Amino acid sequence: HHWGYGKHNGPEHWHKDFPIAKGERQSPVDIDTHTAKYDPSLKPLSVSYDQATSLRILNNGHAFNVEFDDSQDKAVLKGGPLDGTYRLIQFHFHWGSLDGQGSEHTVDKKKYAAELHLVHWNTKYGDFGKAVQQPDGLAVLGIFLKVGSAKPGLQKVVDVLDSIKTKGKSADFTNFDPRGLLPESLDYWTYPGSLTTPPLLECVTWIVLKEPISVSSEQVLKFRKLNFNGEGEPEELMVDNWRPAQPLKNRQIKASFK
Numbered sequence: 001h002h003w004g005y006g007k008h009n010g011p012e013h014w015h016k017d018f019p020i021a022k023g024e025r026q027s028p029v030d031i032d033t034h035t036a037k038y039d040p041s042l043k044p045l046s047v048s049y050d051q052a053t054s055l056r057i058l059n060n061g062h063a064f065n066v067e068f069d070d071s072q073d074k075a076v077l078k079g080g081p082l083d084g085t086y087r088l089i090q091f092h093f094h095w096g097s098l099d100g101q102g103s104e105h106t107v108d109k110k111k112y113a114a115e116l117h118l119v120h121w122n123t124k125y126g127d128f129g130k131a132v133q134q135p136d137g138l139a140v141l142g143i144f145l146k147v148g149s150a151k152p153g154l155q156k157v158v159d160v161l162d163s164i165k166t167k168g169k170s171a172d173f174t175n176f177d178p179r180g181l182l183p184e185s186l187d188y189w190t191y192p193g194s195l196t197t198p199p200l201l202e203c204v205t206w207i208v209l210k211e212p213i214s215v216s217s218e219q220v221l222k223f224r225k226l227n228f229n230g231e232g233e234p235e236e237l238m239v240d241n242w243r244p245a246q247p248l249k250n251r252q253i254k255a256s257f258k
């Protein structure tokens with residue numbers, strides 16, 4: 001009886017195995033645009049993905065992960081609110097059963113159809129397992145998806161999903177360029193928070209981009225054909241794999257932009 005996204009194992013149950021679920025810096029949150037203060041001390045985000053080396057795509061039973069070679073400083077996030085250098089390890093998405101839900105963060109209570117998370121770890125801790133034990137261990141870049149025009153840079157991901165339909169399936173996924181998933185603007189909000197899946201550790205600097213990317217109805221429908229279940233098990237469509245907004249508590253959301 002492991003955690004998941006259902007009635008009997010979804011987010012309102014997670015606190016029983018992971019008591020930090022009711023902690024002081026949980027994610028995601030609602031971004032109240034009127035309350036988020038412009039911080040002129042924040043730097044432009046530096047996204048250096050030119051040498052990013054994707055290796056593989058994996059259906060982990062909750063989402064799909066696109067994994068990178070993080071054995072050197074290839075793909076790195078720095079600047080913005082960050083001190084030092086954060087290495088790209090993977091990205092994944094959260095999405096809904098319908099276009100009106102799917103994102104984890106909300107913007108004035110608006111839910112987007114999906115949310116992309118690019119996960120990076122602080123190189124000062126040496127390995128991601130040490131980094132997740134630190135309050136400044138991870139930086140996650142969050143990007144909203146809305147349904148409209150197709151995202152050409154996403155289609156290589158969409159086209160491999162048929163080969164990882166079920167939990168535990170992986171596929172070689174080399175030479176994927178994550179620059180193709182970024183919007184035009186790097187304007188962002190930032191706040192201190194947590195992983196949004198168990199173990200829910202409070203180790204993340206969140207950087208949420210204001211400008212969403214557009215994907216087509218056909219692209220997001222292919223996300224919704226994935227399965228939470230393993231091969232030869234009863235079909236449970238991989239949809240609504242998002243945690244709802246959590247209490248902001250004693251935190252300030254900062255804007256990089258006026």
Ligand SMILES: [N]S(=O)(=O)[C][C][C]C1234B567B89%10B5%11%12B5%13%14B%15%16%17B8%18(B961B%18%152B5%163B%11%1374)C%10%12%14%17
Binds near residue numbers: 132197
């Ligand atoms: N929705 S979310 O908080 O970005 C989930 C992040 C999950 C992970 B934790 B460990 B650290 B890195 B890899 B593995 B798990 B995987 B990635 B971050 C590693």
Ligand SMILES: [Zn+2]
Binds near residue numbers: 092093094117196
């Ligand atoms: Zn995520």
